[PDB]
């Protein structure tokens, strides 16, 4: 017996066994359906596709995400994504194994209740737990003091933690994430005359975002520089062998994490939300929070984003303070890895919400015991 440890981002599913070095199945959390009247009688029929099958067929399909902004928003497809993960990706009977489920810090409280009820009624999981992402990043990064910044496909959030006391009022959620970087990237790409309209075409853009985009250390200097030369400009191939060529347009999307007005958010942007999360904390803690800043999640992977975060946060903090940024290349996994650690600790065995205890108490129990 070992605990399965599972993450549902908005963007991916990351899955394995507690005490693995790294996750064993990764795939997009995406469900496809055929847009069309299938022509050929005597072809096999697929009623839907889950995960990376749909990524293969994508040009034929409507692609929907069952999760956005870290919320489960249509359930009967999400249930399908889990059914795919347990039976097809990891090849385990889940009835034997306990499980961890992963969630953003403020999200609607019904989300926990349904996420419980599916596990216990549908599969008869032996026991379960639900854990805050920016907590598990501290386990992965080997620390018990820091301000985590964690940014998914769908949600971004700071959490300050100090010596293992999470600090609720400190905790501030943005809804900027790599998805809204992506949509904005499509809207800017229209400016250079390419229109990426459909869902799979959106994912084609998303690969551009993953490969070519980088964070301007100085925005204004490079925004002048791209007018000043070709040198920043770089080019990429569509799947059909069309070439597309991209200039300042490639860094300008990462910059929307620093000036959300480009997207039309009202709120501060991740540097200023980080500094305000520190300031909401007590003066004693603050010298140690400035000492540890942990980038987490996939959105942080952009080249140079750590050096931007340090440069911009420096101008807000008092001049004496040491401010230091921590950025392991693991970090995209680090929220799974922390769960891998956590489910193996023998102290944790007290924590599992058991099938008996739920069946007696009902899914309200997840609020009381889990957090």
């Amino acid at each position: 017996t070992t605990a399965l440890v599972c993450d549902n981002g908005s963007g991916l599913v990351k899955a394995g066994f507690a005490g693995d070095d790294a996750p064993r199945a990764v795939f997009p959390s995406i469900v496809g359906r055929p847009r069309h009247q299938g022509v050929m009688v005597g072809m096999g029929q697929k009623d839907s596709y889950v995960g990376d099958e749909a990524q293969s067929k994508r040009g034929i399909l409507t692609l929907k995400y069952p999760i956005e902004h870290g919320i489960i928003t249509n359930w009967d497809d999400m249930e399908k994504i889990w059914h795919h993960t347990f039976y097809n990706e990891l090849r385990v009977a889940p009835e034997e194994h306990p499980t961890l489920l992963t969630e953003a810090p403020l999200n609607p409280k019904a989300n926990r209740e349904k996420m419980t009820q599916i596990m216990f009624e549908t599969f008869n999981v032996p026991a379960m737990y639900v854990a805050i992402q920016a907590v598990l990043s501290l386990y992965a990064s080997g620390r018990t003091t820091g301000i985590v910044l964690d940014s998914g496909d769908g949600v971004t959030h700071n959490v300050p933690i100090y010596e293992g006391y999470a600090l609720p009022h400190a905790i501030m959620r943005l809804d900027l994430a790599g998805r809204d970087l992506t949509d904005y990237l499509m809207k800017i790409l229209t400016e250079r005359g390419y229109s990426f309209v459909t869902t799979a075409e959106r994912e084609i853009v998303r690969d551009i975002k993953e490969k070519l985009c980088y964070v301007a250390l100085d925005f204004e200097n490079e925004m002048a520089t791209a007018a000043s030369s070709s040198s920043l400009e770089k080019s990429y191939e569509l799947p059909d062998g069309q070439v597309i060529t991209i200039g300042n347009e490639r860094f300008r999307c990462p910059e929307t994490l620093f000036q959300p007005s480009f997207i039309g958010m009202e709120s501060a942007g991740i540097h200023e939300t980080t500094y305000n999360s520190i300031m909401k904390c007590d003066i004693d803690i603050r010298k140690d929070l400035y000492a540890n800043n942990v980038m987490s999640g996939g959105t942080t992977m952009y080249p140079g984003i750590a050096d931007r975060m340090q440069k911009e946060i420096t101008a807000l903090a008092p001049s004496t303070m040491k401010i230091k940024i921590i950025a392991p290349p693991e970090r995209k996994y680090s929220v799974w890895i922390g769960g891998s650690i956590l489910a193996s600790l023998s102290t944790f065995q007290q924590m599992w919400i058991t099938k008996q205890e739920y069946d007696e108490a009902g899914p309200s129990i997840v609020h009381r015991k889990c957090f």
Binding site: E68, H69, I71, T73, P108, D175
Partner: peptide, 7 residues
């Protein structure tokens, strides 16, 4: 969500 946002 249910209010301030589409989910």
């Amino acid at each position: 969500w249910x209010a301030x946002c589409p989910a």
